[PDB]
Design an enzyme around this catalytic site. Structure first.
Site, mmCIF file in Angstrom:
data_model
loop_
_atom_site.group_PDB
_atom_site.id
_atom_site.type_symbol
_atom_site.label_atom_id
_atom_site.label_comp_id
_atom_site.label_asym_id
_atom_site.label_seq_id
_atom_site.Cartn_x
_atom_site.Cartn_y
_atom_site.Cartn_z
ATOM 1 N NE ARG A 45 12.227 112.142 47.347
ATOM 2 C CZ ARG A 45 12.448 111.033 46.642
ATOM 3 N NH1 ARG A 45 11.829 110.800 45.494
ATOM 4 N NH2 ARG A 45 13.334 110.155 47.075
ATOM 5 C CD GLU A 136 14.338 104.123 47.059
ATOM 6 O OE1 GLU A 136 14.817 103.443 46.129
ATOM 7 O OE2 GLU A 136 13.126 104.429 47.128
ATOM 8 C CD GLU A 246 11.028 107.107 46.317
ATOM 9 O OE1 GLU A 246 10.711 105.917 46.074
ATOM 10 O OE2 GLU A 246 12.162 107.561 46.123
#
Ligand SMILES: *[C@@H]1O[C@H](CO)[C@@H](O)[C@H](O)[C@H]1NC(C)=O
Ligand SMILES: [Zn+2]
Ligand SMILES: [Zn+2]
Ligand SMILES: [Zn+2]
Ligand SMILES: [Zn+2]
Ligand SMILES: [Zn+2]
Ligand SMILES: [Zn+2]
Ligand SMILES: [Zn+2]
Ligand SMILES: [Zn+2]
Ligand SMILES: [Zn+2]
Ligand SMILES: [Zn+2]
Ligand SMILES: [Zn+2]
Ligand SMILES: [Zn+2]
Ligand SMILES: [Zn+2]
Ligand SMILES: [Zn+2]
Length: 335
Positions: A45, A136, A246
């Site tokens: 990522r 997010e 994450e």
């Protein structure tokens, strides 16, 4: 078994440019992405920023990191922050030059941007597996136009970003992922997804994956049990595969700012503790049919705390730039 055994190693190029070389489990100096690939990681990522003043994490930066990832045999997940700097639940700044007044203009800028990113990768023959439209985004993106005062705007922007990817010349279209923080908090996740889908501007088919952050050290409510319920509910309610994009676990955390969740409080702070945590997370995801885990920034030696109140969340010792045994956790879990 998980489909994606991942790491986010965005800092790598900056660390190399600061003189960091990494020593592997064989005691040899080796490129960090090859250390990961040889230890069971199969996907990487990478955060992307739009017009950062110093070039950090920009498009060119990411093309070079992705070439290396692909050379190492791993898949590429592009995490588009859609900002010139860190995008998180407390910061979603619109890039310099993009509109803060006209949603039609901004929607076209987002579309053009994600198309251009993807066509740059296509033009250079770099396949990409996953792209996230924002990072997010529970409190929106591209403020002020994409704040939670305008979920209609948020949906428009997500729609536009997603179609920019769908219209790209990549020979296989990436899976499109939406990413919220607090994956353990089902009511928060539900509120966001239900609300953007009800606007009529985001299509249910616009995204393929639901990704969540999951950290143990910002809130005692982040139990594995609540994560399990939330992931189950996300998959069943919205019909999309789910993953953790994450996470981190400390080797050292002398003075935590928040109590650790009850079902994790027996796990030690050590490299072995990192593995136990990840093994339990993986089992949790398996139980529910989840498809991935990405460990966040295992090799960011100049920033061992990774923003938390813990001293050290890395899988590399900053004192000697040598990987810890936890670097092979994904391979260990296979086998
Ligand atoms: C999007 O890109 C096109 C070029 O294909 C350009 O004509 C247009 O002005 C761009 N839209 C915005 C709002 O920048
Ligand atoms: Zn497994
Ligand atoms: Zn460099
Ligand atoms: Zn921030
Ligand atoms: Zn206009
Ligand atoms: Zn705002
Ligand atoms: Zn407003
Ligand atoms: Zn509005
Ligand atoms: Zn449309
Ligand atoms: Zn809540
Ligand atoms: Zn699609
Ligand atoms: Zn995060
Ligand atoms: Zn650094
Ligand atoms: Zn050491
Ligand atoms: Zn192990």
């Amino acid at each position: 078994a998980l489909t994606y055994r991942g790491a986010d190693i965005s800092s790598l190029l900056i660390e190399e440019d600061s003189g960091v070389a990494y020593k592997n489990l064989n005691g040899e100096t080796q490129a960090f992405e090859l250390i990961l690939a040889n230890n069971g990681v199969n996907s990487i990522r990478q955060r992307i920023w739009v017009n950062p003043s110093d070039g950090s994490y920009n498009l060119e930066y990411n093309l070079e990191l992705a070439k290396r990832v692909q050379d190492a045999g791993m898949s590429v997940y592009l995490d588009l922050h859609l900002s010139d700097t860190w995008a998180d639940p407390g910061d979603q700044a619109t890039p310099s030059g993009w509109s803060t007044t006209d949603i039609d203009t901004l929607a076209w800028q987002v579309y053009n941007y994600t198309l251009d990113v993807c066509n740059t990768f296509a033009e250079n023959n770099v396949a990409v597996e996953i792209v996230s439209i924002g990072n997010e985004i529970r409190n929106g993106l591209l403020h002020p136009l994409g704040s939670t005062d305008h979920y209609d705007n948020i949906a428009r922007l997500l729609h536009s970003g997603a179609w920019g990817v769908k219209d790209s010349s990549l020979s296989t279209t990436p899976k499109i992922l939406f990413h919220l923080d607090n994956g353990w908090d089902w009511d928060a996740q539900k509120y966001f997804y239900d609300t953007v889908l009800a606007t009529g501007t985001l299509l249910s088919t616009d995204f393929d994956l639901i990704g969540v952050s999951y950290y143990p050290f910002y809130n005692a409510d982040a139990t594995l049990s609540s994560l399990k319920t939330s992931l189950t509910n996300l998959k069943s309610n919205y019909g999309k595969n789910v993953l953790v994009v994450e996470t981190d676990w400390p080797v050292q955390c002398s003075s935590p700012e928040y109590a650790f969740p009850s079902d994790l409080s027996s796990i030690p702070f050590s490299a072995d503790g990192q593995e136990t945590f990840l093994g339990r997370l993986a089992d949790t995801l398996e139980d529910v049919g989840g498809v991935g885990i990405y460990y966040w920034e295992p090799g960011w030696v100049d920033n061992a705390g990774l923003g938390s109140s813990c001293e050290d969340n890395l899988m590399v010792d900053w004192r000697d730039r040598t990987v810890r045994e936890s670097i092979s956790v994904f391979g260990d879990l296979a086998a």
